[PDB]
Symmetry: C2
Subunit: 211 residues, 2 copies
């Protein structure tokens, strides 16, 4: 219209289900209103008449991480408008589709602790808490993906050659080490069943004699 | 509703037809939208989703200074709203009625010039330009009120006693002075036919030997 431009570059920013919709451009005499819906669903307004160029949609997508979502950003004129005729009203742009389950990014994992139990070392990776709520509790990464989530351990002797690997479908690894040694490990989460965004980044590395 | 309060103290600020609607309160997670209509007329939006606590309605009231106007201030939720249920929407408050012709304030007048033409002095008051538009020109105060506007001259000898008066229905006075003297004048506009807001404030005073 004569006082409004449609938003563009509607991109979804989601890591561990924390979901923000980002768009352009920084407004001038214009405010936005962001709406969300499951594909083919009712539309619901979340961020109202704001000058912000992003909207946190976590509270809604978390209602059912399996649903496919669609967002709509409206452009509204702001301030003392020309009057004369009448401000045209409601230009909006639809976001790309978002299936949180299949698309949220797996954040970088953290090794919680390792301990030597004989010739065996037990590596526990931290269970990350999410905002997915069920009953009166927040689900963890593991609680949400269940058997779909897998961890990979990379460990190598502080000295050399290659890194050996191990995988687990729980939050812990139990491995055989060359006794009385210094080993370093790092872990990476993976969702094998995904065609895209399958892996996370490696956790920082931890070593045996951390002193 | 659960996130919005209705505006209050809707007061009209108008001097020489420059008309601003002022209201309370300073918003928090809320924006306003101001609409105007002739009493019983169609509503038109002027200031959109703003955080401002005032709206300049001059461009509209000036369309017909004789009409009676009414303004409506809506309250709209702003920002990332609770979601959960649904933001209630549209609480609004109507302004008192405003008839510009009968109500705008007469601004302080300015004596443009005085000159001695014999035993006569001619005092000219400045014709104030307004935003009232007609064809391709801006009307002056005089052009709008015509015969309803009147000026009063107050003049007194620089020495003493009382101030004498004179009235005119044009922009100038022609008075008889005690020759070779020092006189001071001040002018005040008046619209006698008004029951309220009849007069303006006195213009600054000007004197004969301004040197």
């Amino acid at each position: 219209t004569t006082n409004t431009v449609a938003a563009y570059n509607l991109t979804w920013k989601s890591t561990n289900f924390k979901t923000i919709l980002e768009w352009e451009p920084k407004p001038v005499n214009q405010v936005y209103t962001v709406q969300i819906s499951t594909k083919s669903g009712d539309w619901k307004s979340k961020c109202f008449y704001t000058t912000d160029t992003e909207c946190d949609l976590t509270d809604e997508i978390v209602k059912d991480v399996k649903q496919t979502y669609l967002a709509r950003v409206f452009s509204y004129p702001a301030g003392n408008v020309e009057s004369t005729g009448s401000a045209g009203e409601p230009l909006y742009e639809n976001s790309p589709e978002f299936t949180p389950y299949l698309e949220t990014n797996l954040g970088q994992p953290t090794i919680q602790s390792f301990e030597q139990v004989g010739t065996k070392v037990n590596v526990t990776v931290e269970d990350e808490r999410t905002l997915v709520r069920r009953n009166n509790t927040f689900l963890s990464l593991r609680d949400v993906f269940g058997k779909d989530l897998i961890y990979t351990l990379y460990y190598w002797k502080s000295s050399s050659s290659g890194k050996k690997t191990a995988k687990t479908n729980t939050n812990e690894f139990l491995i055989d080490v060359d006794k009385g040694e210094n080993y370093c490990f790092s872990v990476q989460a993976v969702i094998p069943s995904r065609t895209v965004n399958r892996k996370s980044t490696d956790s920082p590395v931890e070593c045996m004699g951390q002193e």
